[PDB]
Amino acid sequence: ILSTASVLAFERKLDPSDALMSAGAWAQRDASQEWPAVTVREKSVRGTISNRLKTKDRDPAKLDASIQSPNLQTVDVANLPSDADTLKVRFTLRVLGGAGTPSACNDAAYRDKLLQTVATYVNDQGFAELARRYAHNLANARFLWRNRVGAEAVEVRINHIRQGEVARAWRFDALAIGLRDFKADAELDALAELIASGLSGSGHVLLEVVAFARIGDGQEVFPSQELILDKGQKSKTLYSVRDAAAIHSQKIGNALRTIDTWYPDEDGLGPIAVEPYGSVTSQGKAYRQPKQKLDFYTLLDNWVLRDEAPAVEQQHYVIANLIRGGVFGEA
Amino acid sequence: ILSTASVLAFERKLDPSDALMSAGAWAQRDASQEWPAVTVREKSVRGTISNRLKTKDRDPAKLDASIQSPNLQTVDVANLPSDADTLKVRFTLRVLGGAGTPSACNDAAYRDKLLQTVATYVNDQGFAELARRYAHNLANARFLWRNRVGAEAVEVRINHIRQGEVARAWRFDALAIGLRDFKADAELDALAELIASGLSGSGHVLLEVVAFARIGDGQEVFPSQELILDKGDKKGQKSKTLYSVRDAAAIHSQKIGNALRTIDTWYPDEDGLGPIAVEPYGSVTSQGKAYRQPKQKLDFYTLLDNWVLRDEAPAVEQQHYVIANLIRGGVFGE
Amino acid sequence: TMSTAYIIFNSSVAAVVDTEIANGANVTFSTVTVKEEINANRDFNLVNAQNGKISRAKRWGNEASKCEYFGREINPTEFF
RNA sequence: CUAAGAAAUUCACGGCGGGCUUGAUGUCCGCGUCUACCUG
């Protein structure tokens, strides 16, 4: 009868390492192994009251009294060294492969039909359409999340470390490659076939990614925050691995899989991140609404159960949602 | 009906660095590397009871008891070297551009209404009004907060850099340009035609701002004061701690940005004078009270609701205030 | 595992570690490392029932170590 | 001259898959630390 699997979860592919942030001068790019680390340090601030007060408590004698006592926070920040201008971000990405084989299913016929459908998908077309888009989000350095805007020239640079040595190197320039269109270059197809053979499974792929962003002398980089769970106050603690400021290994990699252009009301508003009920919090709302039939769950249950194969512009989405992993069972 | 969003957030533009400090003589033209830093040192003061006393404790014996057990503190201080007279404050400013588009919004119709309204503002009149008022506060050394007052010749150099090398340089005198009059020169209207070009997204703008202030030989500068925690109240505790970035006194990266956006000369209470800093419920802390109160209608949160939703577009001298506040940033939810 | 307020909303969610959010000022105090729960629209406040404690209101009133959660939180369903 | 006298709990185990924590901020201003002293 092939009912839906009660418990189903998937191991991910495309793992990113943790991101490291170093600092230096732009002319010393090609010898930047021993650049010092962008350290985190504490500073103090002093705010005011800048929130929308309600209609009741808009008394004149209370607002000046509330701002007479300000709120003295203690913020952590990260600045580049005052003699350095170029921010170096280094992280390594490994490509696992075997995207169909799940982690913990229940029915054997569900698992076998799932692997059969995924084998048909890899048989008719390659992963080439789902690898000319991951290679873009390595090229135009979206993984620099807020450090990208207002940068002078963003040179990203990617190596193939098969052994301890490098196999074949690549340099791009992340502003020649736009943040919206997916072009077709001669050195985004030697990279895309590499991630294609890594995801299909015909080898092992480990990629070293460094990204130099030109921000300026003494400027302010942005690493990712943490939690301030439970006076001695503090706010906005950044995340540093061994006192070197760091982007998380899921904020990086979240920019690896903003691939999804195939979704309704697409008004040229750019790709979003792939998700079941494909949603972004920054836009507030959730696209791929389940009342539409262009979801993920009701796209898998109409392809592994009733075999109604959707358009190839959604089979590029379902497989990519399988590549990020996740839980998919009736929890 | 259309109502306001619940999440609103705008990234800042006019990104300031941290103001580094240095000291040297005049003939400052080759001050690029030889000028050492202003190292923060400690000292030891021994105060006396100087505050106001209440109706209680008006006893001479109690006052003598307070005096004979004096207060002893360990403040920090930063002075110039005793063979130099000029403090050099250097910081790099970056202006980003795209000043209307938020970074987090719920209702897409509200976002489209906002990006229609800010575009009508920009296509109506440029950023050449706000860029002039930022070029003033970059021109005279407003950002020297207390190190300015009582100086002799505060020479402000401003470089604009396209690469490592410098594209175009300017040199102003910070005392010819005053502090309450936005009078247009032949250079500030060339600087507004760079800041307004950067704010309209027409290119990249990096301004290395250097400001020399001759205070005097061996005199006393003021960097930005940090805050100490609630430690053990004994005799020997630190009572004042200065900010410092790798053995150099410095000013904070918001102590610059509070000076730069001192723009608003449009609050209704013009009994006094002075371009205050731009704020929602526009208020300065040193004066304590709050101009642009929501009791009157001249606020910011009333003006954005009256401009975007009901299309009661206010006066132009108030319409600059909203766009400057959106250049500042913050959260403006419901 | 608590005795909440009088909200009869749905199968609530609860945690004890609580951070304060500032961005998005219609929701305050977003909850951290949160755990599921089900009361399945029960009548009174005490029904929390994580894995073991459903009946025995005397034992529930004995279970006052981490209790009296206020409930007024990010959502009428979601509790403290 | 003791709520004294007395006593083997043991064997074996798959926790496990997934993730954007964002935005902004002015810490201000004032100060007397004195008096002495044999290290062979």
Put simply, the answer to whether C22 touches B9 (Cβ < 8 Å) is no
Helix ranges restricted to H, A74-189: 108-124, 134-139
Asked if B280 and B334 sit in the same domain, the reply is: yes
Q: What is the token pair recorded at A321?
A: 């949602």
Residues of A with Cβ-Cβ distance to C17 under 8 angstroms: 229-230
What's the residue count for chain B?
Answer: 334
Q: Which residues pair with A291 in a beta bridge?
A: none
Find all residues with CB under 8 Å of A2, minimum gap 6, and list them: A107, A109, A110, A113, A304, A305
Asked if B4 and B145 sit in the same domain, the reply is: no
Asked if B317 and B243 sit in the same domain, the reply is: no
Asked if A81 and A200 sit in the same domain, the reply is: yes
Å between CA of A218 and C1' of D38: 59
Helix (H) or strand (E) holding A328: none
Asked if B310 and B280 sit in the same domain, the reply is: yes
Neighbours of chain C (3+ CB pairs under 8 A): A, B
Residues of A with Cβ-Cβ distance to C32 under 8 angstroms: 227, 229
∠B144-B150-B153 over CA atoms, to 5°?
Answer: 75
Residues of A with Cβ-Cβ distance to B167 under 8 angstroms: none
Residue A324 CB lies within 7 Å of the nucleic strand D: yes
Q: Are A193 and A131 in contact (CB under 8 A)?
A: yes
Residue A214 CB lies within 7 Å of the nucleic strand D: no
Count the domains in chain A: 2
Give one word for B173, left, alpha or beta, with left for phi > 0 and alpha for psi -120 to 50. beta
Residues of A with Cβ-Cβ distance to C19 under 8 angstroms: 227-229
Residue B239 CB lies within 7 Å of the nucleic strand D: yes
Asked if A251 and A306 sit in the same domain, the reply is: no
Asked if A57 and A113 sit in the same domain, the reply is: no
Range of the domain at B195: 12-98+127-262
Nearest chain B residue (CA) to C22:
B331
Asked if B87 and B147 sit in the same domain, the reply is: yes
The answer to whether the Cα torsion of C47, C49, C55, C58 is positive or negative is: negative
Is C20 an interface residue toward B (CB < 8 Å)? no
Residue A68 CB lies within 7 Å of the nucleic strand D: no
Amino acid at B133: R
Q: Of residues 166 to 205 in chain B, which lie within 7 A of strand D by their beta carbon?
A: none
Asked if B29 and B132 sit in the same domain, the reply is: yes
User: Among all chains, which residue has been given the structure tokens 């119709």?
Assistant: B109
Determine the Cα–Cα distance for residues A160 and A155; give it in Å rounded to an integer. Answer: 17
What is the bridge-based pairing of β-strands A86-95 and A20-24? antiparallel
Q: Are A18 and A91 in contact (CB under 8 A)?
A: yes
User: At which of B221, B236, B262 does a domain end?
Assistant: B262
Q: Which long-range contacts (CB under 8 A, 24 or more apart) does A64-71 make?
A: A64/B283, A64/B288, A64/B289, A64/B290, A67/B281, A67/B283, A67/B285, A67/B288, A67/B290, A68/B285, A68/B288, A70/A46, A70/B285, A71/A46, A71/A47
* For chain C, counts of helices (H) and of strands (E): 1, 2
User: At which of A232, A258, A284 does a domain end?
Assistant: A258
- What SS3 state is found at B60? helix
Nearest chain B residue (CA) to C25:
B333
Q: Which residues pair with B262 in a beta bridge?
A: B277
A235 exposed, middle or buried (CB, 10 Å; 0-12, 13-18, 19+)? middle
Q: Are A301 and A4 in contact (CB under 8 A)?
A: yes
In B127-261, the DSSP E strands lie at 154-161, 166-173, 205-214, 250-251
Count the domains in chain C: 1
Asked if B274 and B137 sit in the same domain, the reply is: no
* Number of Cβ pairs < 8 A linking chain B and chain C: 19
Determine the Cα–Cα distance for residues A273 and A281; give it in Å rounded to an integer. Answer: 10
Range of the domain at C10: 1-80
The CA radius of gyration of chain A, in Å to the nearest whole number, is 23
Residue A96 CB lies within 7 Å of the nucleic strand D: no
A233 exposed, middle or buried (CB, 10 Å; 0-12, 13-18, 19+)? exposed
CA of B330: nearest nucleotide by C1' is: D24
Asked if A133 and A249 sit in the same domain, the reply is: yes
Put simply, the answer to whether C19 touches A51 (Cβ < 8 Å) is no
Residues of A with Cβ-Cβ distance to B258 under 8 angstroms: none
Neighbours of chain B (3+ CB pairs under 8 A): A, C
Q: Are A2 and A207 in contact (CB under 8 A)?
A: no
- What SS3 state is found at B95? strand
- What SS3 state is found at B21? strand
User: At which of A233, A258, A283 does a domain end?
Assistant: A258
Asked if A75 and A42 sit in the same domain, the reply is: yes
Q: What is the token pair recorded at C63?
A: 């279970």
Is B30 an interface residue toward C (CB < 8 Å)? no
- What SS3 state is found at B135? helix
Q: What is the DSSP letter of C25?
A: T
The CA radius of gyration of chain B, in Å to the nearest whole number, is 23
Determine the Cα–Cα distance for residues A42 and C74; give it in Å rounded to an integer. Answer: 31
Structural method: cryo-EM
User: Among all chains, which residue has been given the structure tokens 């209790």?
Assistant: C67
